[PDB]
Amino acid sequence: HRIVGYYQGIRPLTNDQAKKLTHLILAFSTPDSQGNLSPLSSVLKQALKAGKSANGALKVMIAIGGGGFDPAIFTSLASNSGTRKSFINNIVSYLKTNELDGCDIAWAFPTSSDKAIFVTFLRDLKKAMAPSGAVLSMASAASAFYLDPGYDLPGIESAVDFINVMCYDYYGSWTKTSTGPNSPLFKGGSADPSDTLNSNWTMNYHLMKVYNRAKLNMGVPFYGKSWTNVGAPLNGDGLWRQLGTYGTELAWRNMGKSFDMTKTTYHKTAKTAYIYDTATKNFLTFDNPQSLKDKAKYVAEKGIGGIMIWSIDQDDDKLSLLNSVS
Numbered sequence: 001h002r003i004v005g006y007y008q009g010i011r012p013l014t015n016d017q018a019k020k021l022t023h024l025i026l027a028f029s030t031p032d033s034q035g036n037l038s039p040l041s042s043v044l045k046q047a048l049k050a051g052k053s054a055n056g057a058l059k060v061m062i063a064i065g066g067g068g069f070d071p072a073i074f075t076s077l078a079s080n081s082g083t084r085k086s087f088i089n090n091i092v093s094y095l096k097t098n099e100l101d102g103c104d105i106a107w108a109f110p111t112s113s114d115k116a117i118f119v120t121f122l123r124d125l126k127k128a129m130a131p132s133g134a135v136l137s138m139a140s141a142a143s144a145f146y147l148d149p150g151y152d153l154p155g156i157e158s159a160v161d162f163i164n165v166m167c168y169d170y171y172g173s174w175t176k177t178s179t180g181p182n183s184p185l186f187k188g189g190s191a192d193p194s195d196t197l198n199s200n201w202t203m204n205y206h207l208m209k210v211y212n213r214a215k216l217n218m219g220v221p222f223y224g225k226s227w228t229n230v231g232a233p234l235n236g237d238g239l240w241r242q243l244g245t246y247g248t249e250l251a252w253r254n255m256g257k258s259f260d261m262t263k264t265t266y267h268k269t270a271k272t273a274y275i276y277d278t279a280t281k282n283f284l285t286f287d288n289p290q291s292l293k294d295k296a297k298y299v300a301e302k303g304i305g306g307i308m309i310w311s312i313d314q315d316d317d318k319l320s321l322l323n324s325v326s
């Protein structure tokens with residue numbers, strides 16, 4: 001039921017976008033070493049106003065932290081009962097001052113020594129947010145490598161209104177073995193070297209640990225990733241190919257300008273889109289309307305509570321991706 005859209009300030013939020021979301025999560029505000037939150041940027045403030053103007057039911061939240069934020073500052077703030085209290089008071093004050101409806105904790109990543117203190121922090125934060133009805137969420141990781149040591153999912157669930165499960169970045173600049181899909185729905189059959197680098201594995205991990213799956217959102221990306229000088233398939237499937245050189249992460253809106261989308265291969269087992277261009281040896285893994293349709297159907301079939309998007313401003317001007325989710 002939920003459509004949770006993260007927003008980075010790549011371009012203005014449009015009135016059509018705001019009407020397709022239940023929650024808009026502005027990214028990011030960061031705490032300093034002492035727990036003061038960074039001021040809301042102009043581009044994020046503009047999107048807050050645009051969103052509420054176009055959709056009076058929309059909940060606009062601030063994501064605190066981020067993939068590019070030192071997680072040791074979260075450890076320090078949350079571990080000390082005194083600084084935990086003042087940080088939480090600062091967050092609640094920040095929501096009031098900036099006319100926000102809630103916040104998303106984006107801690108990348110909690111370690112084994114953070115597991116219990118993260119739960120205490122979220123529980124205490126919800127208590128402070130409850131009188132105003134402010135919405136609390138957090139972003140969850142996608143592999144057991146991070147999930148097992150750092151995430152007490154039952155405890156997190158008991159504190160938050162929903163969990164935004166980040167089912168993407170399964171392959172990237174760190175991958176040394178081959179190309180692969182940024183965000184497949186499933187394992188891709190017998191040629192797939194991995195059982196776990198897919199959204200279905202990640203969501204099943206969460207489903208086995210949480211009490212109520214309605215509190216989960218399955219995350220989907222509106223971006224893809226490129227490699228260059230890519231060679232032959234490893235074991236007969238063109239999704240996993242001999243590595244050349246990592247390229248970059250590309251927003252959907254910028255893909256068609258640089259890749260020939262008529263050469264898209266849709267992997268029928270993994271449910272993922274890629275392009276291998278035999279002329280240039282460029283490789284692109286991405287999500288497209290078909291993969292998002294398959295993902296929305298999966299969410300409905302499994303009874304998962306919603307879909308999360310990173311990030312809605314990466315969509316094209318005609319909202320090809322958001323309209324396929326919608």
Ligand SMILES: *[C@@H]1O[C@H](CO)[C@@H](O[C@@H]2O[C@H](CO)[C@@H](O)[C@H](O)[C@H]2NC(C)=O)[C@H](O)[C@H]1NC(C)=O
Nearest residue numbers: 185186187188189199200201202203204205269
């Ligand atoms: C999605 O993931 C689930 C969970 O891993 C897969 O279901 C398992 O499938 C294996 C192989 O058939 C069985 O050993 C388990 O009994 C299944 N567990 C559950 C809870 O169903 C499922 O196959 C995956 N879906 C796809 C399309 O790959």
